[PDB]
Every structure is written in structure tokens, then in C-alpha cells.
């Protein structure tokens, strides 16, 4: 129950898998696809890429990013990323996933973001809990993107 703050924001959705291997402390995130993304270019679509941050206690510990897909609101990525998180800390971290529009000049604006892990709620918490309940198994799930203002207030 609960969560769902981004549902009516019409920013789009992201699908990714999570896998956690406790013995090795290996956390794997596969960015699969995004859909229904907000348009971010005047006269056009968006040039989306995805950023992943590992966080704890308001600090960005590690940063990864996908390749950029041009001129689409429904990008497919299928790009894998791994992090090292010891099992004693896996319930105390966040994985933050942000979709942005690449612009050749100017700060790249976020479309929206979500996080899973500590302090996550709703479908975000469910995905994380499913990952932890099933060591070694990747679990794929869709998530609704939420405005950065809101998500960042929860992460800070
Ligand atoms: Ca733009
Ligand atoms: Ca752009």
C-alpha cells in the first residue's frame, strides 16, 4: 500500500531489473526501457538517457549513466550496471534512477526520477523487497517517474 506520488505527473515510466547477491555484495541494475516520456525539445521529442546513483544519508556515493537515445519518447537501453554494497548495508541504501534529456549545449534537464531502497514506498518498496527476498534472482518492474523536486526532498 501507499506511495504513488508521481502517478498523475505524466512524466513517463521506466522499467529496470534489480538483483542482489548477498555473499558477494553485488547489486546489479539493468535499465531496460522507458515509455511515455515527457517531450523536452521544442518542435521535437526528447534525447533520453538514464542516470543511476547509489546513495546513503543524502550523499551520492556512485554515479553511472546509459548511452543517449535520439529523438524518442520510448527508448530501449538494455544496459547493465553493478554496485558493491555489503549485506550489512543493503537495507540502508537507495538506488536512484533519473531519466534526462540530452542537450548538446546547456544543462541536461531531468524528465523525472524514482528511487528504491531505504525510505522507498509503494511500488518502489515492493521492487526492493522482492529483490531482497530472492537472492541472486533479477526482478524486473515498471516505475512511474516523479518530479525531481519531490524525489530530491525525500533523498536529502
Ligand atoms: Ca531539451
Ligand atoms: Ca534534447
User: With the CA atoms of 130, 134, 136 and 138 taken in that order, what torsion angle do they form, in degrees rounded to the nearest 10?
Assistant: -40
121-143: string of b/e by CB count within 10 Å (b at 16+)?
Answer: ebbbbbbbeebbeeeeeebebeb
Kindly report the CATH number that applies to the domain delimited by 1-156: 2.60.40.150
- Asked whether residue 130 is marked as a ligand-binding residue, the answer is no
User: With the CA atoms of 28, 34, 38 and 39 taken in that order, what torsion angle do they form, in degrees rounded to the nearest 10?
Assistant: 110
| 40, 5 contact by CB (below 8 A) | no
What ranges do the domains of the chain cover? 1-156
**Ligand in nearest proximity to the CA of 103:** 2
Ligand 2 centre to CA of 101 (Å) is 5
- Asked whether residue 13 is marked as a ligand-binding residue, the answer is no
Measured between alpha carbons, how far is 114 from 151 in angstroms, rounded to an integer?
A: 7
Resolution in A: 1.0
- Asked whether residue 109 is marked as a ligand-binding residue, the answer is yes
Amino acid at each position: 500500500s501507499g506511495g504513488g506520488g508521481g502517478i498523475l505527473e505524466k512524466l513517463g515510466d521506466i522499467c529496470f531489473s534489480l538483483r542482489y547477491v548477498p555473499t558477494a555484495g553485488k547489486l546489479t541494475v539493468v535499465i531496460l526501457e522507458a515509455k511515455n516520456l515527457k517531450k523536452m525539445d521544442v518542435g521535437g521529442l526528447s534525447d533520453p538517457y538514464v542516470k543511476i546513483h547509489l546513495m546513503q544519508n543524502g550523499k551520492r556515493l556512485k554515479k553511472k549513466k546509459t548511452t543517449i537515445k535520439k529523438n524518442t519518447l520510448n527508448p530501449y537501453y538494455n544496459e547493465s550496471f553493478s554496485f558493491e554494497v555489503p549485506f550489512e548495508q543493503i537495507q540502508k541504501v537507495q538506488v536512484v534512477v533519473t531519466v534526462l534529456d540530452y542537450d548538446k549545449i546547456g544543462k541536461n534537464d531531468a524528465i523525472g526520477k524514482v528511487f528504491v531502497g531505504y525510505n522507498s514506498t509503494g511500488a518502489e518498496l515492493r521492487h526492493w523487497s522482492d529483490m531482497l527476498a530472492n537472492p541472486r534472482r533479477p526482478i524486473a518492474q515498471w516505475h512511474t517517474l516523479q518530479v525531481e523536486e519531490e524525489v530530491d526532498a525525500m533523498l536529502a
